[PDB]
Amino acid sequence: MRECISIHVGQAGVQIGNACWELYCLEHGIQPDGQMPDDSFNTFFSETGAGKHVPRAVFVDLEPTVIDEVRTGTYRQLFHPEQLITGKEDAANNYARGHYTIGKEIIDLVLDRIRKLADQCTGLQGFLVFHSFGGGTGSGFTSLLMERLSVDYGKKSKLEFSIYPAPQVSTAVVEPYNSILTTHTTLEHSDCAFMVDNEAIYDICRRNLDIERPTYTNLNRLISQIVSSITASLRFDGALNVDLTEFQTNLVPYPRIHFPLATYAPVISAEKAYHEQLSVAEITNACFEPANQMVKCDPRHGKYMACCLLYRGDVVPKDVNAAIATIKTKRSIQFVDWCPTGFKVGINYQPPTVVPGGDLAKVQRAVCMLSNTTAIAEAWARLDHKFDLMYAKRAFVHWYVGEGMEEGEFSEAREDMAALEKDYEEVGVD
Amino acid sequence: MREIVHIQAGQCGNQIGAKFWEVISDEHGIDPTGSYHGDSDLQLERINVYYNEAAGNKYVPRAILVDLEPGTMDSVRSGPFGQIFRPDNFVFGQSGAGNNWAKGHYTEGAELVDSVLDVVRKESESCDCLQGFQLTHSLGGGTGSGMGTLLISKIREEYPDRIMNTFSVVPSPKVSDTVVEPYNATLSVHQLVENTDETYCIDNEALYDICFRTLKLTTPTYGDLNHLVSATMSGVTTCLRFPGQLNADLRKLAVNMVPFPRLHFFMPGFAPLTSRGSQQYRALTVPELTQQMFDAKNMMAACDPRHGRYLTVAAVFRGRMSMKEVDEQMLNVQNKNSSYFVEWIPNNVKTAVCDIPPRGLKMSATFIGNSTAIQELFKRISEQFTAMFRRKAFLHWYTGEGMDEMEFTEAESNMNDLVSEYQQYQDATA
Numbered sequence A: 001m002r003e004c005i006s007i008h009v010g011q012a013g014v015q016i017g018n019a020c021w022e023l024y025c026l027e028h029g030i031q032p033d034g035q036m037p038d039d040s041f042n043t044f045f046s047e048t049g050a051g052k053h054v055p056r057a058v059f060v061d062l063e064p065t066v067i068d069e070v071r072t073g074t075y076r077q078l079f080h081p082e083q084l085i086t087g088k089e090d091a092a093n094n095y096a097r098g099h100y101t102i103g104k105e106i107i108d109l110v111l112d113r114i115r116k117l118a119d120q121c122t123g124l125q126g127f128l129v130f131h132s133f134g135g136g137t138g139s140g141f142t143s144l145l146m147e148r149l150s151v152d153y154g155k156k157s158k159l160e161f162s163i164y165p166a167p168q169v170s171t172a173v174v175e176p177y178n179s180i181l182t183t184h185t186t187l188e189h190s191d192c193a194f195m196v197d198n199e200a201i202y203d204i205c206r207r208n209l210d211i212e213r214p215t216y217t218n219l220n221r222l223i224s225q226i227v228s229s230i231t232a233s234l235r236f237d238g239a240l241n242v243d244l245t246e247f248q249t250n251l252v253p254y255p256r257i258h259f260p261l262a263t264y265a266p267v268i269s270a271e272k273a274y275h276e277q278l279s280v281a282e283i284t285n286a287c288f289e290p291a292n293q294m295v296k297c298d299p300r301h302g303k304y305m306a307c308c309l310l311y312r313g314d315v316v317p318k319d320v321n322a323a324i325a326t327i328k329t330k331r332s333i334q335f336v337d338w339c340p341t342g343f344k345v346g347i348n349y350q351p352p353t354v355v356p357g358g359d360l361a362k363v364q365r366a367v368c369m370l371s372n373t374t375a376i377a378e379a380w381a382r383l384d385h386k387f388d389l390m391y392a393k394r395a396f397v398h399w400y401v402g403e404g405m406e407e408g409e410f411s412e413a414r415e416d417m418a419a420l421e422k423d424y425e426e427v428g429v430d
Numbered sequence B: 001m002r003e004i005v006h007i008q009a010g011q012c013g014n015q016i017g018a019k020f021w022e023v024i025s026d027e028h029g030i031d032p033t034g035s036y037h038g039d040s041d042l043q044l045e046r047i048n049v050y051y052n053e054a055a056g057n058k059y060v061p062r063a064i065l066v067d068l069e070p071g072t073m074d075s076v077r078s079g080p081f082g083q084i085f086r087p088d089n090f091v092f093g094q095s096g097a098g099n100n101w102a103k104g105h106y107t108e109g110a111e112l113v114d115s116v117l118d119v120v121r122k123e124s125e126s127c128d129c130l131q132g133f134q135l136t137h138s139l140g141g142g143t144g145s146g147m148g149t150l151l152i153s154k155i156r157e158e159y160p161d162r163i164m165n166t167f168s169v170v171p172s173p174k175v176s177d178t179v180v181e182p183y184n185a186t187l188s189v190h191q192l193v194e195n196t197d198e199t200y201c202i203d204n205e206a207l208y209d210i211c212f213r214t215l216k217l218t219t220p221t222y223g224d225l226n227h228l229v230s231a232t233m234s235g236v237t238t239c240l241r242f243p244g245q246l247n248a249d250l251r252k253l254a255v256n257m258v259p260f261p262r263l264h265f266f267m268p269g270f271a272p273l274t275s276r277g278s279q280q281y282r283a284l285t286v287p288e289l290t291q292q293m294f295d296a297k298n299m300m301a302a303c304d305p306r307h308g309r310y311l312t313v314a315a316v317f318r319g320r321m322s323m324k325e326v327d328e329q330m331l332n333v334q335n336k337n338s339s340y341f342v343e344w345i346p347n348n349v350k351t352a353v354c355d356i357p358p359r360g361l362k363m364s365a366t367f368i369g370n371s372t373a374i375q376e377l378f379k380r381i382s383e384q385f386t387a388m389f390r391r392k393a394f395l396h397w398y399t400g401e402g403m404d405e406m407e408f409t410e411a412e413s414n415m416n417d418l419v420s421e422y423q424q425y426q427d428a429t430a
């Protein structure tokens, strides 16, 4: 009943998946071994006959290190070995290697395992995908898996918690190639995706979490907190719940434009927990600031289609309505004439659950805000500007060419992104 | 992409490879008998990349030693760790080539190339998921250069799917065994660029200069150069011998570094330089070394990067890191020398951080760069070959072994084509 499958591919994908599943099992009081000391956990979990609960997800990669780390980590007894897919030869920062040359030897096993997991699912609702744009595995393998799943199922929703590479955390120089190729490939195949810029989380950790130098651990803890705030609606119940079908309904102008921008509040470090906790009005007023989104964009330029809210903790609806009324008076918010209003409001009375030993501090209440806008265009603008700088001299092209690729793919992906940004300004003009 | 096999040839190459193994075993806590003797678990995590497990807990290098002169091989077991290498690796000749390429290529290279391919096969299907092959060898010496050409040709026609690295010892006019070196040097560099994809240009000119002016050695013997050779060429492998999210494998190294299929030559550098027995260095701060990377005086390729533009830059830091200031040094270096980086490759200056430091030094930073400025070495060898070849001298020995001057003409034309590629990529705008 209402099952939802999670897909984790690539190093970053599996790292953030481990973090998010840890937060999920902690929130629902699920022990690290899966034992029970809302009944919506069955959407994200499968109940073994012994009473143990194992997540209905999968760990896929072409590299054996991080999978082995999971196999010897805290939750090694949580997941069965079969959904922890292990490769031998990695894509090595190459969309082509992770798509054609090497992915083919593993995609068959991957889809067999996905079907095996789905065998226990009756009311399957959709697919959650976690993958880094920069990584060759998490781009080529992600794109081909997206194509295969769309062939297999199609109309079923297929989410994507995409990771946007950032120069501070970037590990390869071919990252714009991989991001362009994967987004051009999955744009038709993905109905809604989440586009989180790791520079945003990095500088939030630098400033808000006062981390001297953010690491993968803190980045992924923050990312998992935000993803948990997003998925609380599927993992709990609310007055106006949002589901994957509802995600598509309330956050898609056109199938091409399916990249909502998210903001989550608040961000208080554990070392400063003694300070007065922020109010609903305070968090609403601090939500739209350029230091709280998922990408390094200024929402002032953009115009919101609809503003979706998800509230966590002890939040009173009356003050929510007051805050919404105050915010609507702001000149920052602008709605297209075609879309009058889409202000869905969701309240989760469950207080947020903090990770033990985490930099962030426990708060009584929290809110995460979803709203897509034309301000998101600047991320693709800088990204495809980097791609154009790449392609003006055909740098690194031979590495793709030697693995079943030609420059025609580069050209068609670049023009597809040009059409996508074209749609961006076109919907942004009344 | 899991393991590396080693091949060394030529007395220079054999000596430098032996010293490399000395350094690697010492930093990984490997005793002469192969048993672990370190003090941390970091070394043993990735010890498999350069070693094989043996009876009990003995670790043996995956090094196949080849040489045509018995003196070199007697010497190579004469030194330390002469017994750790298994006798199977030792497949050798007796005639001696003596500064000639084609004669050792055909008249005497056939009867041992079969054996070396047999042993590298035994290693290969003994190995599970090897990344590729890295070779250290001399270029001016006809023996080592010819053996290296044989090995590269056979391994590429046998294992074209493996990223096959190599390390090059460019001949030096100042320290030259003979004068007919540029013939074999040009032939071997032609074969190298036309057949390999990863090479480090370690010219003895730069080594002699740095050991003379900076080490205050009036007559630096081959051991004096070999000390710095071993230090830096362990430094390049630091990213391949310890955990790290940068430069995990040889394939990732290629994808990150080399932008063009033909141009794949490297210009290795490392600071701080350390003499033999000189341990007066204090705790060197990051700013001085990160401004010292721009220097060509600490460069192990006889070229000056100030005359060219960096394509892609790699560097690894070892010691205690407050690497926030390291990132600050990146920012300052970029903002101050963007003119020396190609604008059409953004975010090409990436570095990692390592915690294991070299021996006797608590701070170190290798500097691996790929720039068009390396064309100075090829211009030097081109002018040498032309000024000593327009007389059509010394060709009797080669022409007596089937060599035809058309091969010389095509090789020199191809290498001038590489020089032209350097020139055209250097002046490319944004």
Ligand SMILES: Nc1nc2c(ncn2[C@@H]2O[C@H](COP(=O)(O)OP(=O)(O)OP(=O)(O)O)[C@@H](O)[C@H]2O)c(=O)[nH]1
Residues within 6 Å of the ligand: A009, A010, A011, A012, A013, A015, A016, A061, A062, A063, A090, A091, A092, A093, A132, A133, A134, A135, A136, A137, A138, A139, A163, A165, A166, A169, A170, A171, A172, A175, A198, A216, A217, A219, A220, A223
């Ligand atoms: N969100 C997130 N991104 C990360 C993390 N670690 C690395 N990345 C980014 O992910 C990109 C690289 O992708 P990978 O994590 O290596 O995943 P992959 O597709 O398997 O790539 P390969 O390991 O080379 O096969 C780089 O831009 C990294 O900066 C992380 O802990 N979280």
Ligand SMILES: Nc1nc2c(ncn2[C@@H]2O[C@H](COP(=O)(O)OP(=O)(O)O)[C@@H](O)[C@H]2O)c(=O)[nH]1
Residues within 6 Å of the ligand: B009, B010, B011, B012, B013, B015, B016, B098, B099, B138, B139, B140, B141, B142, B143, B144, B145, B169, B170, B171, B172, B175, B176, B177, B178, B181, B204, B207, B222, B223, B225, B226, B229
């Ligand atoms: N750094 C270094 N260079 C060497 C060494 N031996 C020879 N060379 C240089 O390499 C060239 C000679 O190559 P050689 O070692 O004779 O190759 P071989 O014929 O295969 O033995 C000369 O330019 C020498 O100056 C050495 O032990 N160390």
